[model samples]
Target: NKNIDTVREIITVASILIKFSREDIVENRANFIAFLNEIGVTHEGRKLNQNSFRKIVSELTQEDKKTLIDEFNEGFEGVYRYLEMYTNK
Candidate 1:
């Protein structure tokens, strides 16, 4: 689960960075850093640098980028939908 969280962070941040500008990223740098901090642990328990995270995203193919966006949106929406169902129960 931690590994999936780490990958999700990379895909999510990369999508945000691609969709917005550097200024936008700077404006929310704290949240960005916070997300990284939340999943920054490695198998060795070392810190994963923000640069490394971004770099991995940067290297993705165009198709992979599109897939990431679609999957992330679905995953995000699913979370809220699940909560709504639970709340209604």
Candidate 2:
């Protein structure tokens, strides 16, 4: 769903910023990796790619999904609708 796309964007970019951006970046990278790792795939799976994200995130519980979106809204910016297209190449 398109909503999940935003969820993907939100999580993926938060992960990216913590590594690729400066300390100005939020320290949420490890949490992002752990979130994926907790779901059964190692963080390395997504560290490489997450075509898994589509299938995997689709399986994420509605409760988890809402919490994720709500968390991002509180702590991250969705960038006025522009999003990174760096996943699932």
Candidate 3:
């Protein structure tokens, strides 16, 4: 689903920005960690990587998927900017 991919990109890049920002790193670190935990990752938890993320996206309810895609389109430019900045890896 292209919409799911779009939403996932937005969320993942936003999470990466939160994870790796140098400014206010302390302030955002917990939130970033929390996002990871929400997705079933933890300090000592098994890493899901891209495959797990794809699976989760595939399983999102239709309404939830619509909401996510709406959110992504609304914020697409900002999300792209953040991705360019923080997702060099």
Best by TM-score: 1
- Point out the higher-scoring one by lDDT: 1 or 2: 1
Error of 3 at 80 (Å): 11
Question: For each candidate, how many residue pairs have backbone atoms clashing (under 3 Å)?
Answer: 0, 1, 0
| Pairs of residues clashing in candidate 1 | none
Worst 10 residues of 3 by lDDT: 41-50
Q: Pick the candidate with the highest lDDT.
A: 3
Return the lDDT, model 2, position 38. 52
Candidate 2 per-residue lDDT over residues 1-89, each given as its tens digit: 34455456556655555446634433343344344445443333343234544454555678766676677673333321222322223
Q: Which run of 10 residues does model 1 get worst, by summed lDDT?
A: 80-89
Off by over 4 Å in 2: 1-48, 74-89
Residues 1-89 of candidate 1: C-alpha lDDT, one tens digit per residue:
35445556554554454346533443454454455567554523545554544444445466755665577785434332332333221
Candidate 3 structure, TM-score to reference: 0.35
Which ten residues in a row are the worst by lDDT in model 2?
A: 79-88
lDDT of 3 by residue, 11-86 (tens): 7555555447634542443453345556554222444344443455455577876676566664444444443454
Candidate with the larger lDDT of 1 and 3: 3
Q: Candidate 1: count the clashes.
A: 0
Model 3: runs farther than 4 Å from truth?
1-45, 74-89
